[PDB]
Symmetry: C2
Subunit: 665 residues, 2 copies
């Protein structure tokens, strides 16, 4: 309707006098720590109710209808889990039997501390790759070769397959303990704002470039070539050239088998996703392609006939717990910190997707403790880092999943695949397992189509995507995440250092002020020049704030005062012998200021002092209360710059000048 007000021009002091303030809360640190820790039984039961989420949904189960859906979904993901687990184990340089352990022990721990319902904890292609980089860099192949075999001329320095795996397993298991501890520290100390720095373009660009390194790494298994485990700078570029140089030393059997299941698993996946309305339950294409693979490889002995690469290394048994090799945390702390954060970032991202669709909330701090205890419990049983794969958790939700009981039943399928089953997968070719991983890389390879979308959107978000994608390819993969966080935080500083300053003018017959570079019919007060400056002034944009003022007034407060004294010598010598035209005032619309950064507030007192010497007043328009209370402490309100210079509304500053020139020409 109508918007009419009638109030005096309360600048700063006409409003601060009659308005009583609130008494601030006293320090009383002695009572604060006492009031924090409660003694009632409600607080004691509350902290345990959220620490062990099993006491929430297990007593409130729905055996009538929920138990039936968990069994059919458990046996579904159990077959997909035991195959993806043994396939992702090749990305971490660990033997194939330790991949099944990563799909059994972490699930048993994510049943009493987990705060999700539709998350299948297990291996992950990106996370297992980062673990494999640590195992290869701290235990290479040329560090275990023993000279034996009565060679021709020199010592028979043959491969030392066998006892070499014990150096890789103890190294991978020790890494997971450090990963679990870091997650417990972030969850215990309630510090979770570090994961907020991993923006969606940063994680999207990181996973896209990580999919390339997985593609090159898995291509080595498909072509059955032998690289030199190049690690460091341009690791993916160097290993890609070595594969092309060793194309002749490939295996036709592994190539024709690996490329065949690549087309089959990908075509059926896109056919099932597109034609979802026909059949609700996705057909286990990854499972049926493995059963037919081990069946063909068993009849025709591809190990002896075509010299293919088979597993033939499944002992089909458990192992006693082994203590981690403590002492290697110094050379792995940098890599473990990156793995622990990227594992939690993917866990929450995938978890929140299936949380808003089934309308339930997932706690953030509990997710750290949940994966923290799982990684520690898996480290004591020779496992690698546990996460949640989007492809594996999609099977548990599509086939019907309600609680974590579907995952517990999925652990029984992996359970029988270790004690009794597992030996049947002996003649399975490693190229088939190296292909089901590439078939799931389609979800991350299609993320490149978001770069043109982010370019039409905020351009700074598209640069972070390309920066992280390239930096996670040139300089390793763990350093790419660190080089992306620093570049992302630097972009935030660049946006608050170079703000969007305008020339706000007045709209006729109203009180609203809009930018002069966006509208035409905006009138400005005669003599007054209004300037808006977002991105509150700090030590970095304090010099730019001076340039913004000099640009909107047309002159410089230093050169004008210099020319005055340079010309005043002629005026003061006439007795012995014998520019700032338009600017009347400067109303600074500092309404978007958040902090002060006293290093920068010293210039605000200087700016008023500079313009006061050239007969120009520098008023303020929209300073907040939390900033004005900060100026009083930083030594700004002296016997010259009083509070009357500040105002509450931008139109109040103009009314103060218009009423001042009428009573004083």
């Amino acid at each position: 309707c109508s918007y009419t007000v009638s109030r005096p021009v309360y600048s700063e002091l006409a409003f601060q006098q009659q308005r009583e303030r609130r008494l601030p809360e006293r320090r009383t640190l002695r009572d604060s720590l006492a009031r924090s820790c409660s003694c009632s039984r409600k607080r004691a039961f509350g902290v345990v109710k959220t620490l062990l989420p099993i006491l929430d949904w297990l007593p409130k189960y729905r055996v009538k209808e929920w138990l039936l859906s968990d069994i059919i979904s458990g046996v579904s993901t159990g077959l997909v889990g035991t195959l993806q687990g043994m396939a992702y184990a090749l990305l971490a340089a660990v033997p194939v039997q330790f991949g099944l352990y990563s799909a059994f022990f972490p699930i048993l721990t994510y049943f009493v501390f987990g705060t999700s319902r539709h998350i299948s904890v297990g291996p992950f292609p990106v996370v297992s790759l980062m673990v494999g980089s640590v195992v290869l860099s701290m235990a290479p192949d040329d560090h275990f070769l023993v000279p034996s075999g009565n060679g021709s001329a020199l010592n028979s320095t043959t491969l030392d397959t066998g006892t070499r795996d014990a150096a890789r397993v103890l190294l991978a298991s020790t890494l997971t303990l450090l990963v679990g501890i870091i997650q417990l520290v972030f969850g215990g100390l309630q510090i979770g704002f570090i994961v907020r720095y991993l923006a969606d373009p940063l994680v999207g660009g990181f996973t896209t470039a990580a999919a390339f390194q997985v593609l090159v790494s898995q291509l080595k298994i498909v072509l059955n070539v032998s690289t030199k485990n190049y690690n460091g700078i341009l690791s993916i570029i160097y290993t890609l050239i070595e594969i092309f140089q060793n194309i002749g030393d490939t295996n036709i059997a592994d190539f024709i088998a690996g490329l065949l299941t690549i087309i089959v698993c990908m075509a059926v996946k896109e056919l099932n996703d597109r034609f979802k309305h026909r059949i609700p339950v996705p057909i286990p294409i990854e499972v049926i392609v493995t059963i037919i693979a081990t069946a063909i490889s068993y009849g025709a002995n591809l190990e002896k006939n075509y010299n293919a690469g088979i597993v033939k290394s499944i002992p089909s048994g458990f192992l006693p717990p082994v203590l981690p090799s403590v002492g290697l945390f110094s050379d792995m702390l940098a890599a473990s910190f990156s793995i622990a954060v990227v594992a939690y970032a993917i866990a929450v991202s995938v978890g929140k997707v299936y949380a808003t669709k089934h309308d339930y909330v997932i706690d953030g701090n509990q997710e750290f403790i949940a994966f923290g205890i799982s990684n520690v419990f898996s480290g004591f049983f020779s496992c690698f880092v546990a996460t949640t794969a989007l492809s594996r958790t999609a099977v548990q939700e599509s086939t019907g999943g309600k609680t974590q009981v579907a995952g517990l039943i999925s652990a029984v399928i992996v359970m029988v695949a270790i004690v009794a089953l597992g030996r049947l997968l002996e003649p399975l070719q490693k190229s088939v397992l190296a292909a089901v991983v590439i078939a799931n890389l389609k979800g991350m390879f299609m993320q490149v189509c978001d770069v043109p979308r982010l370019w039409k959107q905020n351009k700074t978000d598209a640069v972070i995507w390309v920066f992280t994608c390239i930096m996670s390819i040139i300089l390793g993969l763990d350093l790419g995440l660190l080089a992306g966080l620093l570049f992302a935080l630097l972009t935030v500083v660049l946006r608050v250092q170079f703000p969007s300053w305008n020339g706000l003018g007045s709209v006729p017959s109203t009180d609203i002020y809009k930018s002069i570079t966006h509208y035409k019919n905006l009138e400005e007060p005669e003599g007054v020049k209004i300037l808006r400056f977002s991105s509150p002034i700090f030590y970095g944009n304090v010099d730019g704030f001076k340039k913004c003022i000099n640009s909107t007034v047309g002159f410089d407060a230093i050169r004008v005062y210099n020319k005055r004294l340079k010309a005043l010598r002629r005026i003061q010598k006439l007795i012995k012998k014998g520019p700032k035209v338009p600017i009347h005032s400067l109303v600074l619309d500092c309404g978007a200021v958040s902090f002060l950064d006293v290093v920068g507030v010293r210039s605000l007192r200087m700016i008023v002092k500079e313009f006061q010497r050239i007969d120009v007043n520098v008023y303020f328009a929209l300073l907040q209360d939390d900033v004005l209370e900060k100026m009083e402490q930083c030594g700004f309100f002296d016997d010259n710059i009083r509070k009357d210079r500040f105002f509450l509304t931008v139109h109040d500053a103009i009314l103060h000048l218009q009423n001042q020139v009428k009573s004083r020409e």
Copy 2:
């Protein structure tokens, strides 16, 4: 007087229709690049005048009295500068004559490109300490010892003084050449915003730590003790422990002489600073104490009698130019970058001080270019990095200085002290030169008294002072500057990630809105809840923004919908068988937003969608045009969330809500 307005409630569309916008400037990069480079002679004359500032003040001289003033200031500053150079030569591990060289050529170079008038370019204690640390880390003492001298049992591995000085001088020349190249690159590319990151507390803490390290080094030199040139982590602590262990192996004469000259110089300096009104020109205490030291040390032969440490290494002659040892840039790039940055920062600080004290302006890029050319010209004549010392430039201002001619006369003093004089300073003890440096450390040691002042002020800036001071002591000195800039940027990011959110309410009979946590008599509209959020929303403060919304509304937009759908199943099953109370709207006062970081506008749209499902409208109050134009591109205004939801003024949203609840119950 009175502040009355009368306008309709223009929310977003009632104001955007009748208000014509301005046509944006076309890209036309061809004409922009063509219009950038000018063809007229005026632009060429201007760039030549601003590149070589000698053509400005030299033809406009005032010989009559300026000649005598510049002559006296030049002889005084020449004495002071040759003393400071022969003193700082010990901090750079180079011989004494090379300090005199570094105090001669940079002054001649800063005469045609310099843009200041009261700057005495030369050595500097901090820069000399950094150069000496680099030289010691890249050329230690145990890397040149030759076994010779027919020792007792093992090889007589005596000291190899001599040819080591050539290697140190070549290394220092390469370092200063790289510094000059980096400065020229920073100046020509017009990139000067990197120096803005060096805040005043950061520079203060860095200078305090550098003064502490200089004190430790000069105490090592005075006591005549030999350390193991420890460099790296905790270098100052290690060398202090080594000095304390080797106290017995000192020289009584050098120690007592150093203590006496320290006391004398400090007493005379404080007496001249306190009683300034008595005598205007400061008495050259350094000059007279050096004269009396070299006079006493010549009569009584302190070299043979008391076995004191004298110079006895002044050849008193020039040297042909030497080409720098190019190829060592890889192992000194970071050190040269830090040295150039700190030198330019100190130079700009001193120039701005002595320019605002004499009412003139000094350019930044021209200063960078001038210092780069000076360092490049000094690198070709066996010198180190050049800067301006606050103690040396104070003499040129106190004794009377108008132009850089005082520097040209100051070079003639060093000129006559290099070719002919200088040999008279042969018996001068190194402890006397190592004491004037400590006497000049009083200005930086008193900066510790600013920590209590910055604590009462903005506390985040007082932590940067202590953080930089400690980090530049534990982990070297060059890394402390890098560890301070990153910490400062992280502190800036933390201030824009955790904003100061309030509960703004309405003041009766007015239209201004103040924080509810600062005033008592503030009334809020029935049902409406206003929330202000500074520090524009980005990928880091999205969860913080959600938490602030949930705290200001009292509930959670997800848990309420969860409970609604969990209670709705009981309602929809009765046919088969047979919270959000106070919150009516949420006006977000997003007036302090600068950018939106589309990852954040996605969360904004998600919030608006979530609150729409619980019958709660989320309006906006003070969104700027530069943010709305970004939201229009980021895919926010769909067929459901129109622009009518946005408003121009905070009171307009309240008026609209009141009209809606009056016209519709």
